[PDB]
């Protein structure tokens, strides 16, 4: 969040400051490249070619979206055509659904036996990316993070800040969740190396 090197960094339903120290069951990460114009399409409630046929976001999102320019990475002279995108699809996409179908999309009523032509189109299209392209036309690398929460024990948590240590002065304390007040000083008895309290 403090890198400040990302064009877009939005958290949906969660505050970036408060989530910096929070416990979740699991976290999901996704990465893909879209055109800079298509950046706004990646949001709950949005609709677009990317939104409908390439990647769908559930409206009740419980994570964050990070976006930044990628022109210097995947935009070359002559066009970087190593990235595809679905322009034609029979229907929309369910949230978090991956489609890799390459069947020739049919527009009219007449079927085509896998041959391009009238009323028959290829569902996937290539992206052209050059350094001379427009700002919205430039390629962008976008990472979206989703947070999972179930009844299973949590595994991921924010970095707890550890304070200092003082002795011989009656002060409040909290060790690993054990709270209380008193005076801290050394002792002589030694625990076994698996016990606290």
């Amino acid at each position: 969040y403090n890198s400040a090197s990302f064009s877009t960094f939005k958290c949906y339903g969660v505050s970036p400051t408060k989530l910096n120290d929070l416990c979740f069951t699991n976290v999901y990460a996704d990465s893909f490249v879209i055109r800079g114009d298509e950046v706004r399409q990646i949001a709950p409630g949005q609709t677009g070619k990317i939104a409908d046929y390439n990647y769908k976001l559930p409206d009740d999102f419980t994570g964050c979206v990070i976006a930044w320019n990628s022109n210097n990475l995947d935009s070359k002279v002559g066009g970087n055509y190593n990235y595809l995108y679905r322009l034609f699809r029979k229907s929309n996409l369910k949230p978090f659904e991956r489609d890799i179908s390459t069947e020739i999309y049919q527009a009219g009523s007449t079927p085509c036996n896998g041959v391009e032509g009238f009323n028959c189109y290829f569902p996937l299209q290539s992206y052209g990316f050059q350094p001379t392209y427009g700002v919205g036309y430039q390629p962008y690398r976008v990472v979206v993070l989703s947070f999972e929460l179930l009844h299973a024990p949590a595994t991921v948590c924010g970095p707890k800040k550890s304070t200092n240590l003082v002795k011989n002065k009656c002060v409040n304390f909290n060790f690993n969740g054990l709270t209380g007040t008193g005076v801290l000083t050394e002792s002589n008895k030694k625990f076994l190396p698996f016990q606290q309290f």
Binding site: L87, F88, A107, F118, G128, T132, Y133, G134, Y137
Partner: protein, 588 residues
């Protein structure tokens, strides 16, 4: 499914990869233009051939959908643009013959010698600076005899093949096909017809006739001082004495005819040189102007990708001023900028062109154009009209902070601008009317020259020095006629320009003469302009004209309002001299 859904899917397919091939071809063309060499020509030709083949294949595929079923009025417009079968109806032999005729015309016009004394090398300078009657007459007659005499039968065959091809496309004539641009159908209360354009131009010319008559009388009166024994008080101006080979513009006549020659004109070239402008501060000032108007910034890649000065000795490049719309968010300007006022004004013009290009980028590929052929140059030009005012130059630090202007300078500037604005309209009208009648078939092939010179005498008031038989083809000498170019755009451009200028100036709450008006620091005028600019070709040009001026059709009253003090001064000056011309008088 329904035809509409299939058409939508087909257009969605076409726009993608149409943008791609267009961008590839534009990049190849820019690479050739910015860096001329043998290798780049091959790439440019290959890209053009690929784009043309793709366009023909896509038109062939789009021929399948019937246009009646679509009821969207935007998919219908895109289909109407795409299903332009056009010249492919001609047979293969006929198409080959037509292409050969066009190529021969281009070649013969490009390389024409009257000797040695080519058209641009010599000839031009002789016709603009000889000041000698015999030399100008010799050059005019020699160019006519060398070019127009040889372009006669090629032009006749061109006419017959083009007329037959136009009739093959369910059009009456080729002139009707040209007039098809000014046609909008399917909208109630906004429709227009091709038969409406034959009128609505004669009306404006009849309106603007008295001003041209007064100007012609004044020019002839001031010109009879020179060439003492070759000009008559009542009669027409000899053809070769208009300061040009064809007399299209009267700019070269300014040096002979000045109302107040004592007062210098406004020129800030020395002011620019003193402050040492670096040929980029000019575009910086243009961007400042367009930002202060209310229009957005320039793209980041504009300043780095585009080249704005001569590359140097090692790298050669043609740098005629040009604004590039390569697509994919790419804008460029090709200019050899120097520290001159003319370069400043043309930089403003091209910057306005770029601003117009940025407006409709969100529209589909087929609708990324102006409303018609006249809506673009006028928008580019009104920027230069706004930037040429003394008030703007005084606002900038280049002009003197304490400048006092007299009405003598106002008259000088008004006449200088009029000699180019109102001096070319009758010529355009006469040339286009003659071409329309020739294509329509009203003028037989044996009466081309007689009717041409009769129109020249009657409408323009220009008489030929020496008679021409039917072997001569004078109109074919012009670049546009021989090279298949339309010409009514220059007639519509000035009317649209002055209407837009008046609308933007009244929106800016300006008081006084129209020629001292400026639209800088006016956000509401910029918003009103941007409302029309963002439309593109999606909506009929009548509604686009209404969105700024408020009138559906073009009106010429603002043009006369612009030139009103000049008209009054001419009426005062010409109260004694004769007004009008006599057709009977001839130089021979």
């Amino acid at each position: 499914s329904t035809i509409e859904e299939q058409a939508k899917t087909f257009l969605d397919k076409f726009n993608h990869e149409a943008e791609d091939l267009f961008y590839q071809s534009s990049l190849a063309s820019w690479n050739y233009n910015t860096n001329i060499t043998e290798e780049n020509v091959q790439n440019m030709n290959n890209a053009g051939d690929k784009w043309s083949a793709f366009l023909k294949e896509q038109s062939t595929l789009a021929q399948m959908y019937p246009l009646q079923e679509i009821q969207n009025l935007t998919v219908k417009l895109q289909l109407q643009a795409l299903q332009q079968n056009g010249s492919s109806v001609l047979s293969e032999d006929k198409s080959k013959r037509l292409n050969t005729i066009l190529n021969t015309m281009s070649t013969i016009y490009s390389t024409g010698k009257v000797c040695c004394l080519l058209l641009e090398p010599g000839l031009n300078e002789i016709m603009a600076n000889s000041l000698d009657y015999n030399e100008r007459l010799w050059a005019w007659e020699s160019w006519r005899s060398e070019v127009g005499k040889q372009l006669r039968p090629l032009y006749e065959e061109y006419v017959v093949l083009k007329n037959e091809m136009a009739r093959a496309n369910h059009y009456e004539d080729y002139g009707d096909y040209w007039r098809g641009d000014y046609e909008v159908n399917g909208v109630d209360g906004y429709d227009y017809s091709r038969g409406q354009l034959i009128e609505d131009v004669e009306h404006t010319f009849e309106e603007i006739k008295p001003l041209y008559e007064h100007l012609h009388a004044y020019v002839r009166a001031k010109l009879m001082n020179a060439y003492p024994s070759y000009i008559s008080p009542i009669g027409c101006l000899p053809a070769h004495l208009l300061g040009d080979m064809w007399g299209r513009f009267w700019t070269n006549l300014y040096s002979l005819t000045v109302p107040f020659g004592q007062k210098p004109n406004i020129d800030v070239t020395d002011a620019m040189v003193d402050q040492a402008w670096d040929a980029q501060r000019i575009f910086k000032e243009a961007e400042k102007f367009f930002v202060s108007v209310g229009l957005p910034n320039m793209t980041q890649g504009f300043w780095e990708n585009s080249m704005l000065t001569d590359p140097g000795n090692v790298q050669k490049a043609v740098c005629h001023p040009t604004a590039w719309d390569l697509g994919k968010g790419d804008f460029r300007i090709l200019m050899c900028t120097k520290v001159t006022m003319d370069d400043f004004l043309t930089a403003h013009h091209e910057m306005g062109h770029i601003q117009y290009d940025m407006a409709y980028a969100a529209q589909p590929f087929l609708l990324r154009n102006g409303a018609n052929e006249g809506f673009h140059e006028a928008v580019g030009e009104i920027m230069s009209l706004s930037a040429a005012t003394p008030k703007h130059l005084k606002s900038i630090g280049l002009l003197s902070p304490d400048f006092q202007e007299d009405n003598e300078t106002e008259i000088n500037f008004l006449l200088k601008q009029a000699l180019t604005i109102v001096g070319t309209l009758p010529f355009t009208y006469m040339l286009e009317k003659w071409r329309w009648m020739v294509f329509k078939g009203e003028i037989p092939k044996d009466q081309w020259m007689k009717k041409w010179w009769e129109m020249k005498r009657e409408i323009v008031g220009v008489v030929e020095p020496v008679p021409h038989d039917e072997t001569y083809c004078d109109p074919a000498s012009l670049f546009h006629v021989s090279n298949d170019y339309s010409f009514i755009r220059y007639y519509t451009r000035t009317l649209y320009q002055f209407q837009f200028q008046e609308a933007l100036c009244q929106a800016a709450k300006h008081e006084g003469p129209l020629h001292k008006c400026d639209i800088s620091n006016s956000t509401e005028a910029g918003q009103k302009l941007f409302n029309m600019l963002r439309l593109g070709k999606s909506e009929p040009w009548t509604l686009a004209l209404e969105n700024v001026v408020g009138a559906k059709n073009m009106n010429v009253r603002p043009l006369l309002n612009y030139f009103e003090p000049l008209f009054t001064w001419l009426k005062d000056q010409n109260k004694n001299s004769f007004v009008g011309w006599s057709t009977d008088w001839s130089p021979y």
